[PDB]
Amino acid sequence: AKWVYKFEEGNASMRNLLGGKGCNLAEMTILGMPIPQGFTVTTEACTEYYNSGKQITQEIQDQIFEAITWLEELNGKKFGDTEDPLLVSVRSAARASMPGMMDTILNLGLNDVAVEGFAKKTGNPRFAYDSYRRFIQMYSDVVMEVPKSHFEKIIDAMKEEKGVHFDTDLTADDLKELAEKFKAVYKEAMNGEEFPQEPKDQLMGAVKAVFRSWDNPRAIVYRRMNDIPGDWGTAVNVQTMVFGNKGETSGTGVAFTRNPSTGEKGIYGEYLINAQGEDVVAGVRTPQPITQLENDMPDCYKQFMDLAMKLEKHFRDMQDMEFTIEEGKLYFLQTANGKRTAPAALQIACDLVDEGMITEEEAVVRIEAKSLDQLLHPTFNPAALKAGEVIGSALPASPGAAAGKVYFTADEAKAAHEKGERVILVRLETSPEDIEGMHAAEGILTVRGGMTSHAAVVARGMGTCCVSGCGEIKINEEAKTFELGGHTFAEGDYISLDGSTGKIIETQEASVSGSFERIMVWADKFRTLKVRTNADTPEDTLNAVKLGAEGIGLCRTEHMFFEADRIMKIRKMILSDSVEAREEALNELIPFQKGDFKAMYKALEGRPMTVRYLDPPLHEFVPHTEEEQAELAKNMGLTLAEVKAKVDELHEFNPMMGHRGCRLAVTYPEIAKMQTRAVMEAAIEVKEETGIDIVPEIMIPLVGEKKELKFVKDVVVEVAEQVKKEKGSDMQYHIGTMIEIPRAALTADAIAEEAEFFSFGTNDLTQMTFGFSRDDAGKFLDSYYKAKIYESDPFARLDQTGVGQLVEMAVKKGRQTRPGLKCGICGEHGGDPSSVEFCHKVGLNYVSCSPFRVPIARLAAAQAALNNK
Amino acid sequence: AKWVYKFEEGNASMRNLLGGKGCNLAEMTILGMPIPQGFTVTTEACTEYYNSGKQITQEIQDQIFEAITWLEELNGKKFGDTEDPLLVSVRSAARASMPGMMDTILNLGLNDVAVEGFAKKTGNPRFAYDSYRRFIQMYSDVVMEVPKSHFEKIIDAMKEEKGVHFDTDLTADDLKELAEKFKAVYKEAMNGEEFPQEPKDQLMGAVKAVFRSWDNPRAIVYRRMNDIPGDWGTAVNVQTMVFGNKGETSGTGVAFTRNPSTGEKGIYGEYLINAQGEDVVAGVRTPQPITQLENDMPDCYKQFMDLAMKLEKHFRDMQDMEFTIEEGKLYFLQTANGKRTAPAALQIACDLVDEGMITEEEAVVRIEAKSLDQLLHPTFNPAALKAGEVIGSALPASPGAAAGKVYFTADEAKAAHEKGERVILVRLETSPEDIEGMHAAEGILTVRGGMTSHAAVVARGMGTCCVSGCGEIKINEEAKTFELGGHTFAEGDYISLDGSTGKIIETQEASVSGSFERIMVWADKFRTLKVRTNADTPEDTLNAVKLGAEGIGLCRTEHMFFEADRIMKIRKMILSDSVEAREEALNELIPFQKGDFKAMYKALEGRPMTVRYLDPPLHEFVPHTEEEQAELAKNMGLTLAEVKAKVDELHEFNPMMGHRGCRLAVTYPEIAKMQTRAVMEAAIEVKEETGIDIVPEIMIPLVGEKKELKFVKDVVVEVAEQVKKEKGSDMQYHIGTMIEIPRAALTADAIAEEAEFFSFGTNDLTQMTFGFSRDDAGKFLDSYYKAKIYESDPFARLDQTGVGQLVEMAVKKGRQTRPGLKCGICGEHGGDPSSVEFCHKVGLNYVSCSPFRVPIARLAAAQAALNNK
């Protein structure tokens, strides 16, 4: 039992049950704010629907109807009465807020007969029909039978037919004429089924519709792209209806107590007088700035304002609130902690902090570590813009600089490769359908929409760029072109930015606010994990160090063998036939490589850098085109056959588990020796010239057995030893390993007899545990996602149930043999907030991710600790 | 009495007496650090010298000699004894540290005979002569008889003559041979006077030399450019000498506990083994990084390190310290709170703050508000550099991007217009002589020098850019060319930056650290004054608002009449012959102007903006070339004579006190009316479209009598009233005034019967009080400075003794009539830290300066309050 809850029986805490919205709805109810009373149908009832083979149970169905009875008795009106019906609103609400994805139906409980009783119990026909026409429209759209296409094409004609141009211009007539039509499209767009006239059939079908929505393709991809588990489920709230379309002194609007896009503090929002919330303000007819309501309805402003703050103060954070004035009566519909843009989050955080509302601890815990990627977005180059063709101006929805080939559909924006293929989504407006092409674009361009529009809203969440409500664009898919200022475009290349302008540009680099830095700072007081980066070069090293990297967890050495001015040596080593020649071949590189390490060691100023031995199998080193093989042979005296034949010798079926990594060192110790000399000579010298202590870290890859690490460790040590023949350094160095094979995790305690430290290469540990190659997975990963087999991408988010197990028991065991054993992570999982919290709990010492993910990890680790203490 | 103090009888507090250095010297003495004992000759003794018509009094002279006796008895050696003399060091020390300006003499107490006693009491001849040769050199340079020219030209020859290349390569022979020579140049470079051989004559002449230095041209300009009052005076410290040139296990070096140029934390510094401090490390022979001493003399490193920190912890801030190892014995010579670069200051501030050493209150008080100008320095454009000709690499002394025409002398860098004429000072090394061309350049380029070099040092203070120790440059004034990489230059155009590189560039814009922002923030918690800006445009307004401007204190309206698409209207107004035509002329502008205010009012989002009425006299509006006058006439039907004759009518002898400002409004009310309409229509409309409250601020300039403000106030009000005929607004507006005339300050209490607020235009108040025109002053201001009549520039630093009086009594009186009267400042004095503290104490409400000075004022006002509470 308890599939339904009243608002009066909740709080912010039952978010889980009550969905985010619903607990808030409850929470405000308890606060005493003017909200239309109602009930929420539990998230567990969603779950329930789903388990119960998509059937609304007796227990529930009943339970809802029961709640409905309470409403009627609650407020004199009877649910669907003939002359004085109850019309409620239906709005889905999952546990975690999520923009442009929520299903909303207003005026539900209206039909062919009640529209009249309603018109009589009101004296306002235009009102009744207007609502009725809207509801027929929503329900069949949300409840999806038919789509907004053939609706807007009707209210549209009617406006032209009538010459009168605002929907708000139609009469109690046209409105019934219009409701005549719509209700005609519902059945066309149906099994010829005539629109349900039974309130009860309507209510169930809405509650139902929602649930059935929560497993929709689109939601699923949104739940993925948003790291949300699809076993949560939406709640369905039902509320008594307030009418924003009652007429001239009625209205609805969305507001936010701080700029959702700048954090900048003070009321922000839009609205429309005499209009319906859930549809109207969020789109078309140019909504007015909530600040203007001061003008229009000053006694509501004061009130609404006082209340918005009462909120913010209440939830200690910026609020996103839907409200309605019904004939001079304001109502709150729903509050939500506003979805912000990264910079905005940072800003509100500092502010609430400085203002005294929240501690730094909460400021830290409240940022979505994953969004900092937003701050490091290449901005626009000044003289680039300065000297740029401004062909447009509009709404600065979500901040940023966009620039890329314009496309007229998600369906094709997407197709042109996700969010990085420099694509601009050009649309009249967007919708949940669009969700994917949006995520894929540099920024979204809309023809019609406010700050509260769907796109403004979604982008800001996704931190994509957005310029909305650009009237002046003349779009046409049929030609797939648009017009602005004087230029015509056809999937061309467009460029824009949040700060209004859109033009016919060079992107450059961040330059992070100080809110970012105080954030980054408070992070640093709480974070236990250190944060090294993954860099192979000094610039990259410089960048991270600047983002706050505390060293290097993965310096890869392949480029030291790849670069042209080095390649042939390895190629000689490969093609060579004797250890003496091979050795020698190698020898030549020492100098080029020792130089690399030097610049590295110099850049770091004494911060650790984990150097990773030669990784790929040799094949990667030879040339596969017999044009280049022909070269090589010339330059070697071999024959084209001598070469290719040797190449073909190096060829492997499953290169991911061939002969590479340490396997190479067991057979070609020379490498480990040459590598060690390069390394050691370098640090000793830099130690010489600077006076800075260096303590080299050598990491042997692909180790699956102790005895196999010991072999290579021996070879390394002898040389690291033989190198202290400058000053016998007595440079201390560390030999550790990559745990990227499951045997290694299984045998960690032994791996640890020889390894001074463990570096988790989750990227490979992942492909091994799962048994699937990254390169090849995608031919099926999608169907995996589509089919809910996998909610998360396993190469981007640490599989904590399998992969995190191996990692976990490797820490536990490596530490049985070596208690002060240092562990680190170095996959992409390092800049993965979740993974980080994992590594934090699991006991790792440091994490490691790209120069850019650093701030992410930093934040993340602070949370990890705050969360887990 | 008390012209001399021992170190043991002081502390950091007597800085005033004891000079900065000396109190520190004392302070460390008291701490128990290894410092050669000594005495300081008071700053008041400097004063004393000067007042007493440049004579070292009996009282003093005696007093010094007495202190000297104490030394001898202090440490077995006798001052100038024949076989075991006392050689001391002499180093000037004023009350406020100041780079590249301090006079230093080491080994003083040596002569023709003692060099031997010294060589015998030592067994080290090369040592004795080496010192002796250095001292003959310093003294005659510092004590200035002769200059480093003909010295380095001698040790130079000797090196070549001897083929041996390091001075450290000369023998106990060459050294006496060399001392033979030097001592020969002293008398050449003299009244044929043979170098004083009397310790006592030497000691006095040094103490003397110093004092006489403190009124040197150069110091004076440095004291100006550094806001230091020349009535302070240097102290002269005398200390027992420690020898860094004793040989291979001796040395000297300068260090700093945090990068003086990045704030970046951890020991930074340079040094030379067997070398003299004060001369050697700071220049030529490539000094080693203080971190390398770990290598060389590890038991000293530990010690020196422990002590450096003991310091920092002691003075709660980064330390600049001179030290010497004498045969494995480390000594501290002097500590000083290091002079930093802006960014470095910010950084150390946050850090000491976060580390727990200092409060935010001190972090704020410790920045030199005047240096923030450094952060807003146009940086380098990425693709500009990215795609730039790197012809050089060297030391990143003082951070920055320099770019400008290269010059081989201050004497000509200067000449090419000060620090903004895009000039690069190209030098082998620099010196106090150079001080001015340095201050004038975009950055300094040196051929030889370390981090601790003179230039590195000076620039960092002046926050000029600096790339030092560029061996590879081949310089020649004789052709005035240099060579780098492969290009030859001749006063060309060079570009560089602190981050090493120097190339054959586009500058762009700041992007302030977050240390800047937390700074800027703590500032904001303490500052009482609000900070509006001075902007006439929206971009400028946008920038300030972004730097933290809290409105506009001065929106100038001339550009609204100047712009081409507007000029003729004012010209018609001028040339017109009837109020009706004039009125009309005016009328046409209303629209162009109302638009200006609108964009303004929109940019501000409801922040105040003080609008300033028409200022200049009309003449500025007509054309003075009879080519343009000919145009105008055509376009007016007038004759060329009709026009010029009218122009000549507008001509005035002293345009600064002609008919302009409000005088115009008394005679041409139309302006005030047109201005008021523009303004009011604009704010009402913007108030309409946004819903944001606007509360216009109208400021009438050049008001010198109440009855005269009342006249224009009347006219304004009637119109502001007649404008509320849209919605009778009941927009509230404010009429206030500019106090820029002394009558106004004298009659403020009455001015206040009509003025809602006072805006101090110190720029004009200054030219009026002083009686001198800015434009014309410079023909004598310099001689004023040169002659010490004026230590500060009165148009850049508020004259608090005269001009601040008028301001001050205007607040006091305006407030006798209008208690809640708001006062504000709006000259350049607004971004003048000192002025700000003044306005803070005086009682102003807000200050106002350019978009860029804002952060300055912000900081400043926080200090103003912290200081004065």
mmCIF file of N, CA, C and O in Angstrom, chain A residues 710-755:
data_model
loop_
_atom_site.group_PDB
_atom_site.id
_atom_site.type_symbol
_atom_site.label_atom_id
_atom_site.label_comp_id
_atom_site.label_asym_id
_atom_site.label_seq_id
_atom_site.Cartn_x
_atom_site.Cartn_y
_atom_site.Cartn_z
ATOM 1 N N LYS A 710 59.239 -9.266 -11.263
ATOM 2 C CA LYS A 710 60.570 -9.478 -10.732
ATOM 3 C C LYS A 710 61.635 -9.566 -11.825
ATOM 4 O O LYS A 710 62.666 -8.923 -11.770
ATOM 5 N N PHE A 711 61.352 -10.244 -12.918
ATOM 6 C CA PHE A 711 62.325 -10.311 -14.008
ATOM 7 C C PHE A 711 62.699 -8.988 -14.599
ATOM 8 O O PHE A 711 63.790 -8.797 -15.032
ATOM 9 N N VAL A 712 61.728 -8.167 -14.832
ATOM 10 C CA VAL A 712 61.929 -6.898 -15.461
ATOM 11 C C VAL A 712 62.428 -5.979 -14.349
ATOM 12 O O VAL A 712 63.332 -5.185 -14.533
ATOM 13 N N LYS A 713 61.933 -6.150 -13.151
ATOM 14 C CA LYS A 713 62.442 -5.302 -12.058
ATOM 15 C C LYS A 713 63.951 -5.479 -11.845
ATOM 16 O O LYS A 713 64.720 -4.548 -11.642
ATOM 17 N N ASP A 714 64.397 -6.688 -12.042
ATOM 18 C CA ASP A 714 65.787 -6.940 -11.888
ATOM 19 C C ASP A 714 66.611 -6.203 -12.889
ATOM 20 O O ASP A 714 67.598 -5.506 -12.559
ATOM 21 N N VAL A 715 66.210 -6.386 -14.128
ATOM 22 C CA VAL A 715 66.903 -5.751 -15.170
ATOM 23 C C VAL A 715 66.972 -4.261 -14.995
ATOM 24 O O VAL A 715 67.941 -3.650 -15.431
ATOM 25 N N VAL A 716 65.916 -3.668 -14.424
ATOM 26 C CA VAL A 716 65.791 -2.217 -14.269
ATOM 27 C C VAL A 716 66.674 -1.664 -13.171
ATOM 28 O O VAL A 716 67.268 -0.602 -13.236
ATOM 29 N N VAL A 717 66.642 -2.378 -12.106
ATOM 30 C CA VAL A 717 67.363 -2.034 -10.969
ATOM 31 C C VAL A 717 68.845 -2.081 -11.284
ATOM 32 O O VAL A 717 69.542 -1.170 -10.894
ATOM 33 N N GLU A 718 69.340 -3.127 -11.961
ATOM 34 C CA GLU A 718 70.767 -3.237 -12.233
ATOM 35 C C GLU A 718 71.273 -2.070 -12.989
ATOM 36 O O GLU A 718 72.321 -1.567 -12.697
ATOM 37 N N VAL A 719 70.503 -1.636 -13.947
ATOM 38 C CA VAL A 719 70.817 -0.476 -14.703
ATOM 39 C C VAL A 719 70.631 0.815 -13.898
ATOM 40 O O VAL A 719 71.433 1.742 -14.005
ATOM 41 N N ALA A 720 69.551 0.924 -13.115
ATOM 42 C CA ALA A 720 69.351 2.145 -12.373
ATOM 43 C C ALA A 720 70.557 2.324 -11.459
ATOM 44 O O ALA A 720 70.962 3.427 -11.138
ATOM 45 N N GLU A 721 71.180 1.190 -11.133
ATOM 46 C CA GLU A 721 72.338 1.067 -10.248
ATOM 47 C C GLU A 721 73.656 1.337 -10.906
ATOM 48 O O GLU A 721 74.511 1.986 -10.326
ATOM 49 N N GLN A 722 73.790 0.756 -12.071
ATOM 50 C CA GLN A 722 74.875 0.929 -12.952
ATOM 51 C C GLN A 722 74.881 2.383 -13.388
ATOM 52 O O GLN A 722 75.927 2.835 -13.832
ATOM 53 N N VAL A 723 73.718 3.123 -13.349
ATOM 54 C CA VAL A 723 73.709 4.547 -13.750
ATOM 55 C C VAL A 723 74.340 5.455 -12.685
ATOM 56 O O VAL A 723 75.150 6.301 -12.992
ATOM 57 N N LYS A 724 74.090 5.203 -11.397
ATOM 58 C CA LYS A 724 74.759 5.903 -10.347
ATOM 59 C C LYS A 724 76.256 5.542 -10.382
ATOM 60 O O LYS A 724 76.830 4.666 -9.679
ATOM 61 N N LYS A 725 76.861 6.262 -11.316
ATOM 62 C CA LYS A 725 78.215 6.255 -11.738
ATOM 63 C C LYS A 725 78.394 7.627 -12.360
ATOM 64 O O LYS A 725 79.114 7.886 -13.338
ATOM 65 N N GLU A 726 77.668 8.510 -11.724
ATOM 66 C CA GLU A 726 77.887 9.880 -12.001
ATOM 67 C C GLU A 726 78.343 10.403 -10.645
ATOM 68 O O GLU A 726 79.567 10.707 -10.431
ATOM 69 N N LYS A 727 77.416 10.106 -9.740
ATOM 70 C CA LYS A 727 77.631 10.380 -8.302
ATOM 71 C C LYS A 727 77.013 9.337 -7.421
ATOM 72 O O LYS A 727 76.539 9.601 -6.273
ATOM 73 N N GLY A 728 76.926 8.162 -8.047
ATOM 74 C CA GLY A 728 76.242 7.047 -7.424
ATOM 75 C C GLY A 728 74.920 7.544 -6.855
ATOM 76 O O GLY A 728 74.571 7.031 -5.817
ATOM 77 N N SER A 729 74.418 8.654 -7.450
ATOM 78 C CA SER A 729 73.269 9.335 -7.030
ATOM 79 C C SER A 729 72.890 9.093 -5.552
ATOM 80 O O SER A 729 72.976 9.840 -4.602
ATOM 81 N N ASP A 730 72.548 7.846 -5.451
ATOM 82 C CA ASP A 730 71.890 7.108 -4.463
ATOM 83 C C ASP A 730 70.553 7.759 -4.604
ATOM 84 O O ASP A 730 69.913 8.198 -3.659
ATOM 85 N N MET A 731 70.263 8.047 -5.883
ATOM 86 C CA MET A 731 68.997 8.606 -6.200
ATOM 87 C C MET A 731 68.222 7.428 -5.808
ATOM 88 O O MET A 731 68.654 6.329 -6.190
ATOM 89 N N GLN A 732 67.124 7.694 -5.142
ATOM 90 C CA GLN A 732 66.152 6.692 -4.793
ATOM 91 C C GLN A 732 65.123 6.724 -5.933
ATOM 92 O O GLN A 732 64.886 7.760 -6.528
ATOM 93 N N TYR A 733 64.617 5.573 -6.343
ATOM 94 C CA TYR A 733 63.673 5.450 -7.443
ATOM 95 C C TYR A 733 62.653 4.457 -7.029
ATOM 96 O O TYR A 733 62.821 3.844 -5.963
ATOM 97 N N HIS A 734 61.562 4.321 -7.781
ATOM 98 C CA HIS A 734 60.529 3.370 -7.332
ATOM 99 C C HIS A 734 60.070 2.500 -8.426
ATOM 100 O O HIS A 734 59.834 2.990 -9.501
ATOM 101 N N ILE A 735 60.040 1.206 -8.205
ATOM 102 C CA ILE A 735 59.550 0.388 -9.304
ATOM 103 C C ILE A 735 58.128 -0.085 -8.947
ATOM 104 O O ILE A 735 57.880 -0.685 -7.859
ATOM 105 N N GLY A 736 57.175 0.188 -9.816
ATOM 106 C CA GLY A 736 55.820 -0.245 -9.438
ATOM 107 C C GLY A 736 55.107 -0.916 -10.570
ATOM 108 O O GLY A 736 55.705 -1.203 -11.609
ATOM 109 N N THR A 737 53.800 -1.089 -10.465
ATOM 110 C CA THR A 737 53.238 -1.694 -11.663
ATOM 111 C C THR A 737 51.852 -1.193 -12.037
ATOM 112 O O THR A 737 51.146 -0.529 -11.283
ATOM 113 N N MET A 738 51.500 -1.481 -13.264
ATOM 114 C CA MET A 738 50.202 -1.271 -13.767
ATOM 115 C C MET A 738 49.377 -2.511 -13.398
ATOM 116 O O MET A 738 49.789 -3.650 -13.708
ATOM 117 N N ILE A 739 48.241 -2.341 -12.684
ATOM 118 C CA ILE A 739 47.353 -3.484 -12.481
ATOM 119 C C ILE A 739 46.295 -3.309 -13.562
ATOM 120 O O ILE A 739 45.375 -2.527 -13.420
ATOM 121 N N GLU A 740 46.473 -3.935 -14.696
ATOM 122 C CA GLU A 740 45.504 -3.780 -15.722
ATOM 123 C C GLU A 740 45.097 -5.152 -16.277
ATOM 124 O O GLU A 740 44.499 -5.318 -17.321
ATOM 125 N N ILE A 741 45.438 -6.176 -15.568
ATOM 126 C CA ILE A 741 45.169 -7.513 -16.010
ATOM 127 C C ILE A 741 44.469 -8.107 -14.816
ATOM 128 O O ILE A 741 44.845 -7.790 -13.692
ATOM 129 N N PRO A 742 43.506 -9.013 -14.977
ATOM 130 C CA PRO A 742 42.886 -9.485 -13.759
ATOM 131 C C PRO A 742 43.730 -10.411 -12.939
ATOM 132 O O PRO A 742 43.556 -10.513 -11.723
ATOM 133 N N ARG A 743 44.724 -11.053 -13.556
ATOM 134 C CA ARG A 743 45.537 -11.939 -12.741
ATOM 135 C C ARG A 743 46.270 -11.141 -11.699
ATOM 136 O O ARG A 743 46.369 -11.504 -10.526
ATOM 137 N N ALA A 744 46.725 -9.999 -12.159
ATOM 138 C CA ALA A 744 47.438 -9.110 -11.302
ATOM 139 C C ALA A 744 46.613 -8.730 -10.141
ATOM 140 O O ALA A 744 47.159 -8.725 -9.023
ATOM 141 N N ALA A 745 45.317 -8.357 -10.395
ATOM 142 C CA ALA A 745 44.458 -8.049 -9.261
ATOM 143 C C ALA A 745 44.269 -9.282 -8.368
ATOM 144 O O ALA A 745 44.276 -9.205 -7.155
ATOM 145 N N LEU A 746 44.189 -10.466 -8.970
ATOM 146 C CA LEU A 746 43.966 -11.656 -8.193
ATOM 147 C C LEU A 746 45.174 -12.016 -7.391
ATOM 148 O O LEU A 746 45.086 -12.510 -6.222
ATOM 149 N N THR A 747 46.333 -11.725 -8.004
ATOM 150 C CA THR A 747 47.536 -12.066 -7.277
ATOM 151 C C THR A 747 48.289 -10.903 -6.724
ATOM 152 O O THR A 747 49.514 -10.977 -6.682
ATOM 153 N N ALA A 748 47.560 -9.822 -6.376
ATOM 154 C CA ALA A 748 48.219 -8.574 -5.961
ATOM 155 C C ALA A 748 49.178 -8.715 -4.828
ATOM 156 O O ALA A 748 50.232 -8.099 -4.810
ATOM 157 N N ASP A 749 48.782 -9.496 -3.831
ATOM 158 C CA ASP A 749 49.594 -9.631 -2.621
ATOM 159 C C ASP A 749 51.023 -10.079 -2.948
ATOM 160 O O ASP A 749 51.949 -9.602 -2.345
ATOM 161 N N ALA A 750 51.167 -10.926 -3.951
ATOM 162 C CA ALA A 750 52.386 -11.361 -4.482
ATOM 163 C C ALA A 750 52.935 -10.357 -5.461
ATOM 164 O O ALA A 750 54.140 -10.349 -5.773
ATOM 165 N N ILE A 751 52.054 -9.634 -6.125
ATOM 166 C CA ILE A 751 52.612 -8.746 -7.108
ATOM 167 C C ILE A 751 53.367 -7.744 -6.285
ATOM 168 O O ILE A 751 54.511 -7.385 -6.577
ATOM 169 N N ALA A 752 52.739 -7.428 -5.165
ATOM 170 C CA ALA A 752 53.298 -6.494 -4.220
ATOM 171 C C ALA A 752 54.634 -6.884 -3.602
ATOM 172 O O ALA A 752 55.307 -6.024 -3.109
ATOM 173 N N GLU A 753 55.083 -8.143 -3.630
ATOM 174 C CA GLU A 753 56.384 -8.446 -3.033
ATOM 175 C C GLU A 753 57.448 -7.681 -3.760
ATOM 176 O O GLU A 753 58.453 -7.335 -3.192
ATOM 177 N N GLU A 754 57.204 -7.363 -5.027
ATOM 178 C CA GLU A 754 58.140 -6.650 -5.884
ATOM 179 C C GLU A 754 57.728 -5.244 -6.278
ATOM 180 O O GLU A 754 58.495 -4.450 -6.815
ATOM 181 N N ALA A 755 56.467 -4.906 -6.143
ATOM 182 C CA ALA A 755 56.042 -3.635 -6.678
ATOM 183 C C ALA A 755 55.934 -2.630 -5.622
ATOM 184 O O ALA A 755 55.370 -2.874 -4.576
#
